[PDB]
């Protein structure tokens, strides 16, 4: 086939989802060019698992799921099979048998704001770890102690989402990164 995959809608979306509420778009029966998806910007990364990046090109008879969201720079390592930490534990989890690619790039120029961008959040607390590709958008007060919270923030009773608050002056590990996860 010779009809272009609409990856431009994923990679070049004006705004990205918070990682805890991550987006998913299905891409099917079209052709693409991995060298167009990844442009090798200085502060960017491209990794594949169980596949060659060339397998992104011929999608004429294949379905790809494009998941996308924003994290901070020092969390990009968690967007991989086998990883631990707040993002992989509580926000976006890949299976051990993940077969696909991860593209992440610094978006300080789009997603920071002099006073703080509070539109991007991540889940800081959860009673247990997500399963692969699970998605949780609940905002129930997290009970960190023995006293039950009754929907009221308080001592040992935490609102579960933390805002990144991205500011363009943040250090290298704290700046925002857009992420596209391509899975087969």
């Amino acid at each position, epitope marked *: 086939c010779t009809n272009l995959c609409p990856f431009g809608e994923v990679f070049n979306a004006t705004r990205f989802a918070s990682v805890y509420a991550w987006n998913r778009k299905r891409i099917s029966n079209c052709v693409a060019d991995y060298s167009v998806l990844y442009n*090798s*910007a200085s502060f*960017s*990364t491209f990794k594949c698992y*169980g596949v*060659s990046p060339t397998k992104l090109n011929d999608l004429c008879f294949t379905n790809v799921y494009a998941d996308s969201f924003v994290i901070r720079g020092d969390e990009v390592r968690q967007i*991989a099979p*086998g990883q631990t930490g707040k993002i992989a534990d509580y926000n976006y989890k890949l299976p051990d048998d993940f*077969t696909g690619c991860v593209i992440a790039w610094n978006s300080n120029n789009l997603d920071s704001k002099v006073g703080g961008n509070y539109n991007y959040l991540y889940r800081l607390f959860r009673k247990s770890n997500l399963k692969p590709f699970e998605r949780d958008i609940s905002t129930e007060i997290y009970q960190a102690g023995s006293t039950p919270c009754n929907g009221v923030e308080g001592f040992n009773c935490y609102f579960p989402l933390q805002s990144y608050g991205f500011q363009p002056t943040n250090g290298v*590990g704290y700046q925002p990164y857009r992420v596209v996860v391509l899975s087969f």
Partner: nanobody
Amino acid sequence: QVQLQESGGGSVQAGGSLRLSCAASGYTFSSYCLGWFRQAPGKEREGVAAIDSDGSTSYADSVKGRFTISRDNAKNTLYLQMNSLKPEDTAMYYCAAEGGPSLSYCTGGYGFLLSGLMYNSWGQGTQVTVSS
């Protein structure tokens, strides 16, 4: 997680040479992205050189023309060859790696590969001391 066992540091006079090596675990080594970092006392860690799974290499400006990063995929070994050493090359040097048992391709841009953001595994560090 990748085990990194590192070796070869030492003392040498200015203008001399020294070679670091790093032995890595795993069965997907040729897919790894690999880097060398260094940290002198009372100054923060700095990316020195990187090589991605395709074999493209990147160098900090201060070592271009003197240091060479290379890899031997058949032996799971990473090297840093250091020539024309200067006193300000004195530092503790670390190999870093991004691996994983299903990792099949691994790269990034210049700034990313020379930062710690790329790597989830670090070697134990070896000392290089350049006497004037």
